[PDB]
Amino acid sequence: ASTGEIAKAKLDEFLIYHKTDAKLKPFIYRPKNAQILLTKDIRDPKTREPLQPRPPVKPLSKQTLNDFIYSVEPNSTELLDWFKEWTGTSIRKRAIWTYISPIHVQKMLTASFFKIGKYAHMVGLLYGIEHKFLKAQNPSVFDIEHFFNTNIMCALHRNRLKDYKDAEIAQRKLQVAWKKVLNRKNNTGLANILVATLGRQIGFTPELTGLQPVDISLPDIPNSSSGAELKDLLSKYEGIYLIARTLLDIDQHNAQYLELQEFIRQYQNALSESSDPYDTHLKALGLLET
Amino acid sequence: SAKAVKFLKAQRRKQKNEAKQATLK
Amino acid sequence: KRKLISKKNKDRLKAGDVVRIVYDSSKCSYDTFVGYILSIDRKQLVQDASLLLRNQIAKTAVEIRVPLFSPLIERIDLLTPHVSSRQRNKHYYIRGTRLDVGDLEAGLRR
RNA sequence: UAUUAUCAAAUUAAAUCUCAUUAUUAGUACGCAAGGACCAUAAUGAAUCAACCCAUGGUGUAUCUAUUGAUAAUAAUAUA
RNA sequence: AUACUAAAAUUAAUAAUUAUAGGUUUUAUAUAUUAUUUAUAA
RNA sequence: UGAUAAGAUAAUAAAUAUGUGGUGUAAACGUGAGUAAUUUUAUUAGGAAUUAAUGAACUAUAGAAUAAGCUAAAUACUUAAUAUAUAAAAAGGAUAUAUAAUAUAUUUAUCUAUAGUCAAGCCAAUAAUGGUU
RNA sequence: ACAUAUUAUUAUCUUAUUAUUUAUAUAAUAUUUUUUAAUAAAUUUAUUAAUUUAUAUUUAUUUAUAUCAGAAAU
Ligand SMILES: [Mg+2]
Ligand SMILES: [Mg+2]
Ligand SMILES: [Mg+2]
Ligand SMILES: [Mg+2]
Ligand SMILES: [Mg+2]
Ligand SMILES: [Mg+2]
Ligand SMILES: [Mg+2]
Ligand SMILES: [Mg+2]
Ligand SMILES: [Mg+2]
Ligand SMILES: [Mg+2]
Ligand SMILES: [Mg+2]
Ligand SMILES: [Mg+2]
Ligand SMILES: [Mg+2]
Ligand SMILES: [Mg+2]
Ligand SMILES: [Mg+2]
Ligand SMILES: [Mg+2]
Ligand SMILES: [Mg+2]
């Protein structure tokens, strides 16, 4: 019983609870109604068998998703099709669509890119569901820092370790990425450096519209030596650390920038317990691809 | 039960009216 | 089953409960029986105890005595608990009165 | 065939001893056909008998509960 | 075990061991209320 | 269009009436078992209790097309705002104007009010076979 | 002497269904709402148990009254 497995069970029970009929919920999830359920003896989908009792259901925590995302196996529908099955729900239901937070996109991206190895499936899935989210009145999930910046992170990851020289395709892909972005919150993280790096790598001149020249001011990580507080402080800033690590690894013009490297060093000070996830993913991707 | 009750009431009214008619005559 | 009839158990079977007896399909070809517990008969030996149940099917009245520890029955399910109207351990006297069981399966399915 | 405790043979006096149906042999043998077996076995019963009470049914002046009428008693306070 | 008989069990209180009947204590049976009901502890 | 064979968007051309939903069986057809008139039929230049907020479904005008839910989704169902003092109601399907979902027209649908039309409920008088064994 | 049917009636037996009654509910779902244990993030108001709480609720109905059908009777 792995942590990812128990998280999968929790979220599966959550989605089953929300997908079950409203009039039936009292007789599936309220122990006070067990005898009434026994008496009235409803049938299952396609009348398989009598309804089974279940315990109450409470809200679902956010970490249950990224936990399995990182602790996934090389390949399985369990996570490959989770996004499709989760989004295959009526926009009317509110919990299923409001659980998704902007900080989960860069979580799902890593597992597909490195461990699962089928990142094309996830990138394909993130097209027809944009308008569905728009109807579901949760358009803020696809933001800039967690979605646009992470998208260019994955794009540069593709271009590195593999041969890429198509300037026209790079330009078109940048434009469609800007199209996919539908929540304009420009924060410390700046994708100007990334677009310049891709432009000089593939021969194409950076071109966009509506972008802001926000300076990078990642919150410096202090010298805390606490426990839960330390790990939570690291957790809430994991992603931008990976951004800075990719920038240092790739961009040779990074010398003029100083916030990235100092923030990286402070994050490593906080991370002294474990190794660097950026090179962890590099190793995983290399060994899986080779 | 109730049928017998209302039947007895009806006969009571019948005989009372008969007695009234006889007394008047 | 011992806990089902345990005198030290508040939620035990009492005369008045309507129960369903389920038979094991691998060991016999019997059908479940819905009946009104007329009596719980316990003896010196624990294994040798029985339920006396009654049911008026259509307009024929049947009563069935089952050994509660016969290996041919898997479990017995309580369909509806007893009411406090009756005032004895063994409700033999309901036979033929307005207290009688009637068509239990039809009532339940109603 | 000269004790006692125990186990006991041959004998003697009795009890018992049974009878239907069904099935296979075999629709065979026998028969123009209709019908249709002896020789054997097995199963279910009948009738009689012997024992037993785990269970079921009866009883159950053991016992417990409800109730009608009359009467009497103990305990509480109250009064003397 | 039994009409009385006859048969069978026990008559222990011990420098070493035995339960016959009643009473007593447990575990059950019956009776019919029963968590509200139990005495409890904490 | 995922720099790879994944899932979507939009269009042209098609499939499904074994999934939800609407309309149609209060008619027509057949029959005469009942039924003798306190509850039926026929007839009045008949009556009021001075007859539903009755439209059933086409005309003639006016107006109106909205919010939440539940269903997979709706022109499915439920609760809610007005609009001739009443707690009085609904619906969307096919262009062209607009994105690096609506505003307007044409089309058929939906709802309410006032009349018309077709239609409804209940009464009176007279009549309706034989047996008084 | 007597026999067998058919129909109809009630001051009479049970009696499916429904209809009117009365009547208590962790109430059965909620609403409602004292509310109370929590949820759960990057630091939330159903969601269960229960606890509202009179609103409807239901099936028990708690008590009766009508009623298809069939019993005896005339
Ligand atoms: Mg001998
Ligand atoms: Mg002989
Ligand atoms: Mg012999
Ligand atoms: Mg003999
Ligand atoms: Mg016996
Ligand atoms: Mg005995
Ligand atoms: Mg007995
Ligand atoms: Mg006995
Ligand atoms: Mg002595
Ligand atoms: Mg003894
Ligand atoms: Mg003794
Ligand atoms: Mg001793
Ligand atoms: Mg259809
Ligand atoms: Mg007709
Ligand atoms: Mg005609
Ligand atoms: Mg509308
Ligand atoms: Mg409608």
- Write the DSSP string, A154-220: HHHHHHTTS----HHHHHHHHHHHHHH-------S--SHHHHHHHHHHHT-----SS---PPP-PPP
Which bases of strand G sit closer than 7 A to a protein CB?
A: 10-13, 15, 17, 26, 28-30, 38-50, 59-62, 64-66
For residue C39, list its beta bridge partners.
C52
Q: Are C24 and C31 in contact (CB under 8 A)?
A: no
For residue A210, is it left (φ>0), alpha (ψ between -120 and 50) or beta? left
Q: Check if residue C90 sits with its Cβ under 7 angstroms from strand E.
A: yes
**Residue A80 token pair:** 């490959």
Cβ burial C62-82 (10 Å sphere, 16+ → b, else e): eeeebebeeeebeebebbbeb
Contacts 24+ apart (CB under 8 A), A217-226: A217/A188, A217/A259, A218/A188, A218/A189, A218/A244, A218/A259, A218/A260, A218/A263, A219/A188, A219/A263, A220/A262, A220/A263, A220/A266, A221/A263, A221/A266, A221/A267, A221/A269, A221/A270, A222/A266, A222/A270, A223/A269, A224/A270
User: In this structure, which amino acid lies at residue C21?
Assistant: I
Tokens of A8: 């999968």
For this experimental structure, what is the resolution in angstroms?
3.0
**Cβ neighbours, 10 Å, residue A64:** 19
DSSP per-residue codes, A237-260: THHHHHHHHHHHHH-GGGGS--HH
Q: Could you tell me the distance in Å between the CA of residue C59 and the C1' of nucleotide G6?
A: 29
The answer to whether residues A61 and A104 touch, using CB atoms and an 8 Å cutoff, is no
**A to C CB pairs, distance under 8 Å:** 5
Chain A CB within 8 Å of residue C32 CB = no
**Diameter of chain A measured on Cα atoms:** 75
Q: How far is the CA of C43 from the C1' of G59 (A)?
A: 37
Cα–Cα distance, C92 to C68 (Å, whole number):
19
Cβ pair A244, A264 in contact under 8 A: yes
Backbone angles phi, psi at A222, to 5 degrees: -75, -175
Q: Which two tokens stand for residue C28?
A: 């016999």
Name all contacts of A45-51 with Cβ < 8 Å and 24+ positions apart: A51/A24, A51/A27
Element (H, E) at C55: strand C50-57
Contact C42, C10 (CB under 8 A): no
Q: Which residues partner with C77 through β-bridges?
A: C20
Helices (H), C23-63: none
Q: Residue C81, CB, less than 7 Å from strand G?
A: no
Residues C23 and C71 sit within 8 Å (Cβ to Cβ)? no
Q: How far is the CA of C1 from the centre of ligand 14 (A)?
A: 63
CA torsion sign, A192 to A193 to A194 to A198?
A: positive
DSSP state, residue A46 = G
DSSP string, chain B: -HHHHHHHHHHHHHHHHHHHHHHH-
* C32 residue type, one letter: T
Q: Which 3 state secondary structure label does DSSP give A49?
A: coil
> How many Cα atoms are found within 13 Å in the side-chain-facing hemisphere of A14?
20
Tokens of C13: 């079977």
Tokens for A163? 């041969």
Within 10 Å of residue A141's Cβ, how many Cβ atoms? Answer: 20
A26-33, long-range: CB < 8 A, 24+ apart: A27/A51, A28/A52, A28/A53, A28/A54, A29/A54, A29/A55, A29/A56, A29/A57, A30/A56, A31/A55, A31/A56
Cα A23 to averaged position of ligand 17 atoms, centre (Å): 22
Q: Which two tokens stand for residue A242?
A: 């990976």
DSSP C16: T
Q: Indicate the SS3 state at residue A222.
A: coil
